[model samples]
Target chain A: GMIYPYKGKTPQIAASAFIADYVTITGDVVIGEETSIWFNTVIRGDVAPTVIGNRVNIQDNSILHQSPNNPLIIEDGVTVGHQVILHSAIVRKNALIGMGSIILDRAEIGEGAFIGAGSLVPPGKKIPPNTLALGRPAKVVRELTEDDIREMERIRREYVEKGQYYKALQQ
Target chain B: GMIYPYKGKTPQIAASAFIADYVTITGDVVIGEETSIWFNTVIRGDVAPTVIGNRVNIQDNSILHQSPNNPLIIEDGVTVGHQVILHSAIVRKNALIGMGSIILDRAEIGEGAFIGAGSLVPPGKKIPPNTLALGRPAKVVRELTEDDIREMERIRREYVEKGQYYKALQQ
Candidate 1:
């Protein structure tokens, strides 16, 4: 992992967080406990503050960036999947952003929302809580079911455990 | 290149190729002369063979991988843009895969085709030659004009020079 400071502000990451191999995290970012940033992910907070809450998992090959004055925020238990690109978006608690998705600046993903794979959430768009959104300029397809919520929870748990396991191996 | 071997197969890259920082290439892979694999890109040919031809430029943060029995191939003069994911895909000569796009398994991008940013080419899809494709389930928007071809050519030429410049800095 390559961590660098920008201007005078540096990244503040929790000791329990897992910063995986080949990942780069730059300045003005704050990461909470048990958060895991996976391989080849780049989080550049050079233009604005980026805050990530506890137990979040940002998966492989993802990129998180911000536009000026538009801070990116990810609440607790969020799951960002592989090859995704997030720009100054706000993702609320427990949301699952599926693989290959793109969330543009000012887009808000509500709590427990599920963004399907390959979806694109346009700038300033908002997806309501507990819904499933998929497509370019993503539209809410349906509300998530109990089964869906359970699966999401399972993924969150597994990633947390997996992150710790990998982190321990590094030592 | 952070080159690594998997199951006794190591990457074979030409000496003239510029592999940028934090880029990883492993397993059964071959890169041709003057090709450039840009920053933070990952090409893991663990499951099958992956081949890139001469003067190809795979831009920043892209992921190129293959599934069992499926070879990922990029012909000469291809330009893969930033943050793209190429999975068992075949991109013909001089193709331009735009930034943030996802080219899924077995997809074939024809020669000189331009995939617009944020597009998604589904599995086994085939994009015709010299067309501009865009959207979620990418559809051909229009045929490329001479100006578009010229612009793409310029980008391809610039990247090749830029890669050499950056490579020199490392030495």
Candidate 2:
């Protein structure tokens, strides 16, 4: 009920990946080990390739799509919260995108950065590494604190556990 | 897979309404004629009732929820765009809530108001009729122009047509 092929392309999902119910993955998409895609999420890679690395958690109701000729990349340990829209963006390793954020086409989220909830990263924008960005057309509000780092890690681990819990419950 | 009853309360959706794939409607909710709930959207009415009027289009990946004792109401011809979060708010007839906006509890959008993309209407805020509003904590920027009115009408008409199209396609 979750995976579909588009044209000549089918999603490549690892055995350890948890693709939750009502989540759809189509076309040229690659999902790596231990990653969890939560409920009602959509990753449609018909227009361009989407490569997601290991231990990433895209939380409930998020969307992952790409523009023509622009690929989407989610690196290892990244955490994207609920209802996010990631469009052709490059999310660097271990970044935390807060709930309801929109990462637009060609935007680059730097390594370990934290984007606050409801923020908008406009097309082609770059959020610097280990910083905190907030607001519409988000700007760097501050550097990521130690507490922030710890919280992000906690969320990442918790999502992994939660995903497994759901996966088992479904059976 | 799309509709759920919560605590003995089930949604009452019109036969003419189009609830898209992966969308969820739960609890005490009523959707009127030709309303389109698009892909992966969620309308959760466990806390309070949700009443959406005729010809309303809540677009892809949006969320609708209510707080305790605060019912959510969307009047006829309202348009809620992609990735929006509407919580316990009241949107009057023909209002256009732009994509990615957040309408918090008790906010009232007057008839025919236009909210710009990425805006936020704070709790208990009110936007007057026939005006245009934008920003983080949205403020009325100007009155709605004739062009804006026409565009709003176009969207309303198009959604009704689109809803019927999907309804047939699914069959």
Candidate 3:
């Protein structure tokens, strides 16, 4: 991980976080306990504050950045999938952002929402809690079911375990 | 390029190619002269052969990979934009894949084609020559104009120059 300061504001990451090889995190960012930032992902907090809460897994090749003065926030237990882009978005607790999705500036993803792969959330759009959304300028497909919740739980749990396993191996 | 070997198969990248910081190329991959792989890009040819021809510029944060037994091929003078994904696809000469696009398994993009930003070319889809395609499960929008071709040429040329400059700076 390449952690650098921007305008003298350094990134503050937890000791238990798993920051994978070739990842870059810069500037005014705060990452909480057990969060996993995977390989080749880039997070640039030069423009605004970016806060990631506990047990979040930001997967491979994702990019996270922010608009000027707009804080990018990811609450506890969020799962950001491979090759996704998050720009000044607010992702609530336990949300699952699918692979290749793009969440634009000021968009808000409500708690436990599931965004489908390759979807795009336009700037300032808000996705309601616990819904399943899919497609370009993503539309709500349906409310999430018990099965969906179970799957989400399984993914987050596996990620936390995997993060610890990888972190141990790094030493 | 980190240039790691997978099962004893090493990457073959030309000395003149500009592989930017935090990029990784592993396994059975062959890169031709003066290709520029921008920052944080990962091309893992562990599953199949990945061949890239001359003067191609794969922009920042892109991911290129392949499925088992499927060869990924990019012919000369191609420009892959930022945060794109090319998986087991064949991109013909002088084509431009726009930013945030995803080209999936077995898709073939014909010569001089332009895939617009945020487009998704589904598995086994084929885009015809000199056309513009966009949207989810991308559809052909229109044929390419001379102006579009000129812009593509400009971008490629600029990238080649930038690559050499950055490479020199690295030295």
Candidate 4:
């Protein structure tokens, strides 16, 4: 468990997880193995549940919320970029939700999908697997190619490597 | 009057309004009855007056500001969504400004209108009342129907309920 400075509550951590300063987590939130939650981000599960799976990276100033009708779920190997909002949505494995995006209530982003920066997924919308969704009231831009997959994988690896450095600094 | 948690207050709040945790309220601001401001949002009225009316919801992580040339005024029953940025704009009654939207200086969103998520309201432009506006540099998509009204009401109710719960926990 790693103790937060202000609240004095330690977050249950896997051996390699990296959490930044100024990240606030209250109540029963689970962050999985090797995950990284970045600066000024808040993961609050006061009303309900917030579950994040292995090797996830949530960047700066992002917020994750939970409600009676919806609880946030981010599956393994997901990359959530800076300034995003995951409001009671479920993001499946290997999804890359870009910077400044919003995943609204009951929205499910499928595995390996890419949601473009600044996109909005309205409530109850389902984004198919391995596709790219962009713009407001997000529409499918295209299917993910082999090159896209490779690039996303590379980005994830880079973040994981960076997380290692952060973990060292914590020590 | 609700006792503020932090020092350096420069605002007046009407009765029965809810301001969520981690919200930074500063400068010459006035919030009317039944308004709800969600978590991690910043409402700064440093340059000019920011007058928000009854039953408005400024959702999580949104940033509100005013410049010397323009001031922000939001009328009753407006829902300004998550991660939205409002800068010196005027939002009329019953409008829904979607998540991640940006309202520029002097822009006006009319009564019962809907500004779609991630849309940018250009500086000084006026959106017509009862319209549904979408896209970058937003244009009118259609008239908002009765269903839109119902949906907005539902969202408001949820926020109000959540706000009450949050306040209770704080106490």
Chain B TM-score list for all models = 0.98, 0.99, 0.98, 0.91
- What is candidate 3's CA lDDT for residue A168? 68
Cα lDDT of model 4 overall?
Answer: 0.83
Interface RMSD, one decimal, each candidate: 2.4, 2.4, 2.3, 4.2
Question: In DockQ, how does model 1 score against the reference complex?
Answer: 0.35
Candidate 3 residue A31 Cα shift, in angstroms, is: 3.4
Question: DockQ for model 2?
Answer: 0.29
TM-score of every candidate relative to the true structure: 0.68, 0.68, 0.69, 0.80
Model 1 lDDT at residue A78:
100
Ranking by DockQ: 1, 3, 2, 4
DockQ for the candidate 4 complex? 0.25
lDDT of 2 by residue, B12-95 (tens): 999999987878899999999999997788899899999999999998788999999999999999999778899999999999
**Clashes in model 1: which pairs?**
none
Model 4 residue A63 lDDT? 79
lDDT of every model, 2 decimals: 0.92, 0.90, 0.91, 0.83
**Stretches > 4 Å off in candidate 1:** A2-16, A21-34, A39-55, A60-77, A82-94, A99-112, A117-130, A143-171, B1-12, B26-30, B40-50, B65-72, B142-169
Candidate 2: which docking quality band?
A: acceptable
Shift of residue A88 alpha carbon in model 2, Å: 5.2
lDDT of 4 by residue, A78-162 (tens): 9999999888899999999999888888899999999999888988899999999997778898999999999999988888888
- Model 1, A26-130: lDDT tens digits are 999999999999778899989989999999999888999999999999999999988889999999999999789899999999999999879889999999999
Q: B63-152 in candidate 3: lDDT tens per residue? A: 898866789999999999998989899999999999988898899998999999989998899999999999889999999999999999
Best by DockQ: 1
Q: Which portions of model 3 miss their true places by more than 4 Å? A: A2-12, A21-34, A39-55, A60-77, A82-94, A104-112, A122-130, A143-171, B1-10, B26-30, B44-51, B65-73, B104-106, B122-124, B135-137, B143-170
